Ligand binder design. Structure first.
Ligand SMILES: Nc1ncnc2c1c(I)cn2[C@@H]1O[C@H](CO)[C@@H](O)[C@H]1O
Length: 289
């Protein structure tokens, strides 16, 4: 349709001219060597049929750029994490986790692996909207098809991959240079869940002579940190989740129902109600508007 573009939030704020609804506009130089935005558009369209991703409204030229126009959502879990003094309660982590296992299952069901799990990439809905309490997944810049579309077969196992990604959440097998698969998306979520609960991960803050060596140093520490220690003083289901996903084979389909039951059983046993009343409920949320 017809859109106008505003200030930076390259991501910009924009407006649908006929509805006067705000939107987000991602921009890539039209003269780019290595254009990637069209590829990310492709992924969002593959995933269109769920309400856990932003809607995309347009891909094409806005001037000296190509533009992808998408639904404007709320703050990221990292934004909200900061708001809540960098810890989340169990109830809030569980509501997040149950949603994101389902979200990740849906991405996997559409033949894609995500490969960029981090709290910055999960957003609540826009304050005041119907889906304001839902958690959404964004940014498929690192995503990849794990099922070849002609052969209908899973991508081959491969080693010595070079590391791109947020070192903090990545799976141990990713650290090792292995081709990422479904398992790795779920392990990374697990690391993020512990991050939320603990306030931090014990391999945060590590520094090295290079970024390559920082990845290695962080991987060493993940390998040297037993799940029993990492999840010490937190429910066993957290460790149960982590052990399960750490043991998954490269080609293995995860039992998403099982992992979800771990958490939904604990949620109920804990006496929690799925009210979408998060730690950040009632707090004034940031907006570009
Ligand atoms: N569609 C959207 N609606 C609202 N905000 C958005 C998006 C998208 I795509 C990204 N963001 C914000 O930009 C930060 C960097 O990805 C993210 O951490 C996030 O806060």
């Amino acid at each position: 349709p017809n859109f106008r573009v505003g200030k930076k939030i390259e991501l910009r704020l924009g407006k649908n001219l006929y509805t006067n609804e705000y939107v987000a506009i991602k921009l890539e130089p039209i003269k780019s060597r290595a254009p990637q935005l069209h590829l990310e558009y492709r992924f969002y369209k593959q995933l269109s049929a769920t309400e856990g991703v932003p809607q995309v409204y347009y891909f094409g030229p806005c001037g000296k750029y190509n533009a992808m126009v998408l639904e404007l959502l709320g703050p990221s879990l990292e934004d909200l994490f900061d708001l809540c003094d960098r810890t989340f309660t169990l109830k809030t982590v569980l509501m997040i986790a149950i949603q994101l296992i389902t979200r990740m299952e849906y991405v996997h069901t559409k033949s894609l692996i995500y490969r960029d799990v981090k709290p910055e990439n999960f957003l609540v809905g826009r304050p005041g909207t119907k889906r304001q309490h839902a958690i959404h997944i964004i940014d498929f810049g690192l995503a990849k098809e794990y099922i070849d579309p002609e052969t209908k077969k899973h991508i081959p196992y491969r080693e010595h991959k070079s590391l791109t990604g947020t070192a903090r959440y990545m799976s141990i097998n990713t650290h090792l240079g292995k081709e990422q698969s479904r398992r790795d998306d779920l392990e990374a979520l697990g690391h993020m869940f512990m991050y939320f609960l603990r306030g931090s991960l014990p391999w945060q803050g590590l520094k090295a002579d290079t970024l390559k060596e920082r990845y290695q140093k962080i991987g060493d520490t993940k390998r040297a940190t037993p799940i029993e220690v990492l999840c010490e003083n937190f429910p066993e289901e957290m460790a149960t989740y982590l052990r399960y996903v750490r043991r998954l084979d490269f080609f293995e389909k995860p039992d998403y129902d099982y992992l979800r039951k771990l958490f939904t059983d604990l949620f109920d046993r804990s006496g929690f109600v799925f009210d979408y009343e998060y730690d950040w409920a009632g707090k004034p949320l940031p907006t570009p508007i």
